[PDB]
Ligand binder design. Structure first.
Ligand SMILES: NCCc1c[nH]c2ccc(O)cc12
Lengths: 233, 338, 232, 269, 57
């Protein structure tokens, strides 16, 4: 499984340059795809999404009217048309792979990311309180997050995702739907909580657990991430 | 020395028959006269799962009682979502004719087999997102009839070459074999404690085998024709057996004789699948009369008829919490009852 | 998140409805016979060459066909014959072991057990009487095995309704039609009229054996489609 | 009297038959969509066409809604033309299935069956709704209109081309199709009997009733077109016979196909 | 001869099947009666569970 992005560089404002994510190692036609960008000083935010088979297409509030996202299922290549690019659009764009059935694990794989730089010339908010936490290996630090409304749906499923963004690496998935652990993640992270308040508990922390931790809700669209909690040694 | 050996064998079944006749003090119909009966059981069709192209032969509930896998003779095996009538996976198969269908207790693997004598195991939770085959098993010379998962590494199978067999998923070889049947084995049922299973065949015999030891413990002979159906009671101390006599027979492991005959005069057609409830009071049996009868297991009376199928019910399955009964038939439909 | 699973279910049902028109446009043909019978010449001439079964997905006249031969099985064939209720035909291959227990008597009891089956009550049998070169090469040797091995051959004559080939010896015609009404006695001994028999005197290397099964399978679906509206 | 009992009979029979087909999963084939179109056609007859005719019959005149007489006449022409064309399509479906049964899935798709059903319904809708709303049905008419009573006035070239395209080409198609269906049935029974009659009775009934219900009525349409001096009451009895085809068809066509016969045994024991 | 060895295997199997300590029929019947009466509430097939707790309604 390998998602490689391309088509980035220096971009004049009002110009256009199309991103391209190449998919390899998996069947591309049965996976939903996302583009999630990250500011150089701020956290992650969601841009666009196409389901499998090009059925539905969703955008964000500051995204729609300008962009166009497209797929190519024989060529296994994502596309994202980028028109009327502004000075707030300088970000690192990740190619995100997800699947949706019952008991699935969406957002399991993330791309490496391409850098597009722009030169010069209702909704659910997620409040992560702690921005920097000074940790020690073995201290078993538990971090928490809050939501504006109850994420617990009528079918008994609550919608909260957890990520760990290492320095120089992609925000890999740890915990999906607040309780479940992802594949390849060791049994040190656990999450629990009500529909509004959430907590992610780490036990017996090592030196590979440093980074910024993020959330995501799937109560409805658009997808909001949150501030971020940085763990420092 | 065949003449002395056959006389010794006939004296041995005479000794077995005399020891079985000496240990029958009362009748199960006599001892269940203090039980208030359930009356009439009314079940309605909650979900009707459509989408199969041909005759559904086998089915198996998941252990979380929401996932469901069904097999059909068109050559494609469909993973179901029972609550929302969704299809999670649709697995194309190499051979068109599959007669068995199995689901792992962890939910990671699904095995199927048929007339090609190949037990193909399919990986559901792999990283690539598509259901691929794990490993084919190629040790039986007869047609596959039944298979149940023990672990994610072990699986026992029934086949039509008078032989049941355990298997190793990682190695690919037969760990032990079961070669005591004289007729074509059609079904097996696993114990809740998993170390025992009983398999009936076409010579009206059901043998209780030992999984760890590899030998046959008991021999149950009460039917008049073939056996197409076998199932264990919730506690694992008894099992009910369906056959082509239009008669279900309950056999107990401890007394090792026939307990109670479930039959009626109006039914002349054979039993294809049997399954118990969670309590063990209700015994549901498929038929070729295009319905399923709900037999009370302790009183042996018709407590209800699940009549919604337009063709012959091949397979029957009740959930692990006893919440729903799903019956699949030859009219390409699998209906989930109340 | 549930809506994308519903959309995935709609894609799986549209994939199933794509294969549904593939499935009902295909005619299913069951191949039955023995090792003495000629089926190593069917593998060279009716495109079997591109496991206990040997399926063959192949086409003639832009019509989908699908043949399936079950390999080495046991004598009690009553349990895997219930899986072939949806087929349109049964292709029966008989060799010629006569004028050369018995192989032909075992094939006759095999046709007796297959024809009087409960699950095959509405399914007809297309009959191939293969190895017709062996019913004329060993006639001139004069061993006379069909008189020793069959006592009904001396009271049998060539039928008046039969259509023989001219320029041929009449003992070869007697050796053909003795087995032809031997096999037709089991088919006309039932009297139900729901399913019939189609004998053919094929030889192993005959390139017309596909059109024979094409025309006879056309005759079976014409039987069903004319019985449906009470026209037969 | 019996004119509303026959309304309740054809409404209950056609609603039951539409329910039989649309609820039974075994009758979901493409050959029964033409019978479905015939069933909504004669159900539409039993709703909208016959009760204004018994309103004309019980009173002797039009007592209400005299402005909608052209709409009732156009719906009567559209309903009889849709019924005869739907019968022609069931005959053509039997032709495409019976004579070449290997090639039936290749040539007959449900898209092509829906295109043929929509083409026949649009051809009857066109040929009815054009000359009675745009007034093309009368040109050089010697028949005078009657005051206050409904007469569908029809000129002789209109009678010729409308009776031709409604009846006389489906009659030739039904005759040609059922003849060589009879020829295939006799050679079919010859190939059955010489190696190992009912169709003549079945399509003798299915051919003889249709023509008995219709042939006269169009003969009296021709006689009222070119000639004169016949009573309009006998024309009303022959129009009642042409209505009564929609009564005696649902009790006879299904009675002769096995699937429907079963479905009737399972639903109504 | 293979028939003598098959009869010897069947005779040894019948001696292994002959000496099984069996209990009475009424004791195992009362055990099945006691199980069935013990888990009677836990069965939603026996008692009609309403639609608040029924996942299929
Ligand atoms: N009841 C209307 C019968 C009918 C069908 N087509 C017609 C054409 C002309 C006419 O006068 C009458 C008809």
């Amino acid at each position: 499984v390998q998602l490689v992005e391309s088509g980035g560089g220096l971009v004049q404002p009002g110009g256009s340059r199309k991103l391209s994510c190449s998919a390899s190692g998996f069947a591309f036609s049965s996976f939903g795809m996302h583009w999630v960008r990250q500011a150089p000083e701020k956290g992650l935010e969601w841009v666009a999404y196409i389901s499998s088979g090009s059925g539905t297409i969703y955008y964000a509030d500051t995204v729609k009217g300008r962009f166009t996202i497209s797929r190519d299922d024989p060529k296994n290549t994502l596309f994202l048309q980028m028109t009327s690019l502004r000075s707030e659009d300088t970000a690192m764009y990740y190619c995100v792979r997800s699947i949706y059935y019952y008991g699935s694990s969406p957002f399991d794989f993330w791309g490496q990311g391409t850098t597009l730089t722009v030169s010069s010339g209702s909704d659910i908010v997620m409040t992560q309180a702690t921005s920097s936490v000074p940790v020690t290996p073995g201290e078993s630090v538990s971090i928490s997050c809050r939501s504006s409304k109850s994420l617990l749906h009528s079918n008994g499923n609550t919608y909260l995702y957890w990520f760990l963004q290492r320095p120089g690496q992609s925000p890999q998935l740890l915990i999906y739907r607040m309780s479940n652990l992802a594949s390849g993640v060791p049994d040190r992270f656990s999450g629990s909580g009500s529909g509004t308040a959430f907590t992610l508990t780490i036990s017996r922390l090592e030196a590979e657990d440093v980074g910024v931790y993020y959330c995501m809700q799937h109560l409805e669209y658009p997808l909001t991430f949150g501030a971020g909690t940085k763990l420092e040694l | 020395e065949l003449d002395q050996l056959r006389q010794e064998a006939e004296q041995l079944k005479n000794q077995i028959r005399d020891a079985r006749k000496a240990c029958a003090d009362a009748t199960l119909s006599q001892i269940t006269n203090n039980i208030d009966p359930v009356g009439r059981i009314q079940m309605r069709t909650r979900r009707t799962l459509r989408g199969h192209l041909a005759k559904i032969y086998a089915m198996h509930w998941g252990t979380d009682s929401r996932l469901l896998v069904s097999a059909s003779q068109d050559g494609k095996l469909i993973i179901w979502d029972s609550y929302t009538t969704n299809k999670v996976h649709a697995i194309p198969l190499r051979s068109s004719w599959v007669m068995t269908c199995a689901y792992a207790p962890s939910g990671n693997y699904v095995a199927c087999g048929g007339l090609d004598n190949i037990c193909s195991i399919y990986n559901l939770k792999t990283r690539e997102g598509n259901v691929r085959v794990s490993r084919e098993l190629a040790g039986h010379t007869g047609y596959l009839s039944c298979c149940r998962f023990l672990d994610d590494n072990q699986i026992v199978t029934s086949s039509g070459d008078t032989t049941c067999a355990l298997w190793d998923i990682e190695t690919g070889q037969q760990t032990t074999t079961f070669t005591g049947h004289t007729g074509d084995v059609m079904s097996l049922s696993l114990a809740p404690d998993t170390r025992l299973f009983v398999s009936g065949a076409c010579d009206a015999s059901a043998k209780l085998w030992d999984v760890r030891e590899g030998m046959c413990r008991q021999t149950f002979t009460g039917h008049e024709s073939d056996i197409n159906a076998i199932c264990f009671f919730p506690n694992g101390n008894a099992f009910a057996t369906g056959s082509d006599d239009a008669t279900c027979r309950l056999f107990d492991l401890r007394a090792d004789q026939e307990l109670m005959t479930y039959s009626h005069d109006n039914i002349i057609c054979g039993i294809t699948s049997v399954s118990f409830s969670k309590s063990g009071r209700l015994l549901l049996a498929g038929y070729d009369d295009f319905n399923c009868n709900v037999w009370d297991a302790l009183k042996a009376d018709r407590a209800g008829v699940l009549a919604g199928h337009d063709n012959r019910v091949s397979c029957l399955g009740v959930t692990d919490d006893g919440m729903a009964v799903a019956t699949g038939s030859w009219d390409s439909f699998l209906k989930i009852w109340n | 998140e549930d809506k994308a699973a519903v959309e995935r279910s709609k894609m799986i049902e549209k994939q199933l409805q794509k294969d549904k028109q593939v499935y009902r446009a295909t005619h299913r043909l069951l191949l039955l016979g023995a090792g003495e019978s000629g089926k190593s010449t069917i593998v060279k001439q009716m495109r079997i060459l591109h496991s206990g079964i040997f399926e063959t997905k192949f086409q003639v006249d832009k019509v989908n066909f699908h043949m399936f031969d079950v390999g080495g099985q046991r004598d009690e064939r009553r349990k895997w014959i219930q899986c072939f209720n949806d087929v349109t035909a049964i292709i029966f291959v008989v060799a010629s072991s006569s004028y050369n227990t018995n192989r032909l008597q075992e094939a006759l009891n095999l046709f007796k057990s297959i024809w009087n089956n409960r699950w095959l009550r509405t399914i007809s049998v297309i009959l191939f009487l293969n190895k017709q070169d062996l019913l004329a090469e060993k006639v001139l040797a004069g061993k006379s095995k069909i008189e020793d091995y069959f006592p009904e051959f001396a009271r049998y004559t060539t039928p008046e309704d039969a259509t023989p080939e001219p320029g041929e010896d009449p003992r070869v015609t007697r050796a053909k039609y003795f087995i032809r009404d031997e096999f037709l006695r089991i088919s006309t001994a039932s009297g139900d009229g729901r399913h019939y028999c189609y004998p053919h005197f094929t030889c192993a290397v005959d390139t017309e054996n596909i059109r024979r099964v094409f025309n006879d399978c056309r005759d079976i679906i014409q039987r069903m489609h004319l019985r449906q509206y009470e026209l037969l | 009297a019996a004119l509303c009992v026959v309304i309740a009979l054809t409404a209950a029979a056609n609603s039951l038959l539409i329910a039989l087909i649309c609820t039974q999963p075994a009758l979901r084939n493409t050959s029964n969509f033409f019978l479905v179109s015939l069933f909504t056609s004669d159900l539409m007859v039993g709703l909208v066409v016959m009760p204004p005719a018994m309103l004309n019959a019980l009173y002797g005149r039009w007592v209400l809604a005299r402005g909608l007489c052209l709409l009732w006449t156009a719906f009567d022409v559209m309903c009889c033309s849709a019924s005869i064309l739907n019968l022609c399509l069931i005959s053509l479906d039997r032709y495409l299935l019976i004579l070449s049964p290997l090639r039936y899935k290749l040539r007959m798709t449900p898209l092509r069956a829906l295109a043929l059903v929509l083409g026949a319904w649009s051809l009857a809708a066109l040929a009815s709704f054009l000359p009675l709303l745009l007034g093309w049905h009368e040109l050089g008419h010697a028949r005078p209109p009657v005051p206050g009573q409904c007469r569908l006035l029809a000129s002789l070239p209109f009678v010729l081309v409308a009776s031709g395209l409604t009846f006389f080409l489906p009659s030739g198609a039904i005759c040609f199709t059922y003849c060589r269906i009879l020829l295939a049935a006799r050679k079919q029974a010859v190939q059955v009997a010489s190696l190992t009659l009912k169709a003549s009775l079945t399509l003798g009934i299915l051919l003889g009733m249709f023509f008995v219900t219709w042939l006269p009525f169009f003969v009296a349409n021709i006689v009222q077109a070119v000639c004169d001096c016949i009573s309009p009451g006998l024309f009303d009895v022959l129009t009642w016979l042409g209505y009564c085809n929609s009564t005696m068809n649902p009790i006879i066509y299904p009675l002769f196909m096995r699937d429907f016969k079963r479905a009737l045994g399972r639903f109504l024991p | 001869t293979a028939s003598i060895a098959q009869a010897r295997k069947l005779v040894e199997q019948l001696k292994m099947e002959a000496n099984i300590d069996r209990i009475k029929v009424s004791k195992a019947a009362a055990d099945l009666m006691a199980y069935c009466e013990a888990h009677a509430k836990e069965d939603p097939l026996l008692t009609p569970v309403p639609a608040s707790e029924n996942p299929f309604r």
